[PDB]
């Protein structure tokens, strides 16, 4: 009876130690949590603020804008149907021939980009910024443009595409899309790219490059419907409450089975970001997979448009 | 306001201490004494001490700290 | 003054607290008062002869 | 109750580590106990030179 | 200026109320602690009683006295009979005192024995008789007792009969209180004590009263022609009808109460003599107290009482 | 839980292994001060000793 395993016994000391230091670690956590979303809830009692002194060269778009005189980078209000309404927009006339119409631009995570299904019909976010001590708003804000907005701009003809994005290392890749549209709601925003070029590889008609076979074509967004956490219409016809791809705050996209990239998706700092960081445990940041990875957000982001010749 | 409040509890608490640790001076003898009242009734009879010293250096203490309260 | 409304809360637990442990003491005393009535009737007999 | 088990456990593991913190200053204890022999190096040396003004003095108070 | 008076300092003196109030509850827990796994050791230890062999002698008698004639000579546990219609008991006969013949009705020596009993158990008797002295086989050395009512009452209710009491103080000095008349009353008298002849170094307690209280607050420290009573009997003194008059209180000990007592033998066995109002159970002197010689808060060492018939003279 | 709180108090037991070795640092710490002048103390009445021998080796030289 040399068995005896009092042994046993001088190790759960060693264990409780830990359990200990760990469970109070946590609950020191909460503290600074508890602390911290309160004094951001109490800067949150007043707005910020922006003076957006609207430039007077307006138009359809913001090509016939840099054909117009029109010649630098900030917010213009545009018009491109007479039945409806102008808007404000941010026009990049500096990126290769300018005359760029900005529609979803990302790189500070100053906007919540996980929003119902409606609040992506419209738009949201920043349009552009006061820069400096200048009084014209000449800095991009991050926004999504609006589901009808971008309908109807790319519906008016051939439209092409630019994507910008850059990781944290401070490298950039851009990939085109010569051709570009993007369908009304009653036949939900159904996207379409083609004539891809660039060094950020074709992941919306390709699918996932480190993919293969049939798991690669379910990550294909070329064809597929529109959908947010709220409304879904992904590529899984199978009805459960654990198949969407839009999950609670995750962005709206034209999601299939599920992506090859999701710009719409979260900030995640730093760039890394695991399965135990996503609220759940899926890769919902802003993702571009042909170029970084599964499991990594971009820095930067941003979606241009300009009719082609 | 509040400051005086606190006193109000801060002293019917102190004088329920006092009030406890009288009988915790009364129960710990009428215990010392009880158990020696085994001796003649039980095979085994406890080895034990009391310190009182002890008592009366923390009732010493409570007192010498009572000070005046909030009336000037 | 700000912090001259804070720390009669650092100062509030330490009532409700000590108040606590009383109490509690106070529950515990009434038991192990059960518990000598149960040695008395336990320390009445004679020595077996 | 556990608020305060709490910031017990803290505070006493917050003292873990300002105990040995001051054990490197017991250090420095043998350095002043290091100047009583480092007072005695000038305290000897002035029973040295006062010894060596009145041994001078002796000498001028009898060319008088 | 009578306004920058505001006292900041209510927050240097309140730390310094609980560095204090919780080094003084925490400090009564762990004390909690300790006297609950004592009552938890005993209460083990009370399992299995404690065991005497005790080999009643030969020589037997009516009372300690006869057994002295009757050629018995030594200090041990003896069986009794007085009259012949009462089953005979036991007794220890101190025969090395005096001039023996000496019929212990009542002992104290270490708390042995609890005496906070109700009126039943004084009226039967109570405690050890005596104790296997080191390794012999008769009990030698006696135990802490008290020989019971009815038996204590006929045992002087026949003839004359003398009392005595010795007692000790924690530092070893003595004194003893004769008293050459003695009796004790029947159950339907209250078993009404009555005393006289006194002599001795110890202070009539029991005729006189205490020797500190004068006029009427001595004349209440009387024991003398007084009835007895116990925490569950009220027959003192006190005719003033509140259930906090009363002079026997649970855990007191029950004697010949008046209002109160100059002495009680019959009181709570506190350790080490010295014993102030606030370790006493209910803040009263209900100790082993002589007051004539002791005070009020001393209770006494050693205390027996002894008795035998009238002859000398 | 209480047990807990009041298992982790302790607490006193490092505190006051603290203000029974920080007034131990503290006694020597006037040790510095009044030590550290005494040092320097010892220094300028030093020094002036130096300058009264020569300050009188000179007139030496006025006797031959």
Known sequence: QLYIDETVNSNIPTNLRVLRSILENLRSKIQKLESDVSAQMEYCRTPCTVSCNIPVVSGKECEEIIRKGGETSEMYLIQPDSSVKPYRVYCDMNTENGGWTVIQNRQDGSVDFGRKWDPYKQGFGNVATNTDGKNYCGLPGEYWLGNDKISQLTRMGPTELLIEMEDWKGDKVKAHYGGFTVQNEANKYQISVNKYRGTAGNALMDGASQLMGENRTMTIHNGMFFSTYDRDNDGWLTSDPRKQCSKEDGGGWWYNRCHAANPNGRYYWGGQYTWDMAKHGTDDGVVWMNWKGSWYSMRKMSMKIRPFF | ?72 | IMKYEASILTHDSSIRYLQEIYNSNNQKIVNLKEKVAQLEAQCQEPCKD | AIDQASQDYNRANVLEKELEAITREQEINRNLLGNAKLELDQLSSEKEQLTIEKAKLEEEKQIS
């Open chain 2, 1 to 72: 306001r509040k400051v005086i409040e606190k006193v109000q509890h801060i002293q019917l608490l102190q004088k329920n201490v006092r009030a406890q640790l009288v009988d915790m001076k009364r129960l710990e003898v009428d215990i010392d004494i009880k158990i020696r009242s085994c001796r003649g009734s039980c095979s085994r009879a406890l080895a034990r001490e009391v310190d009182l010293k002890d008592y009366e250096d923390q009732q010493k203490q409570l007192e010498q700290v009572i000070a005046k309260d909030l009336l000037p």
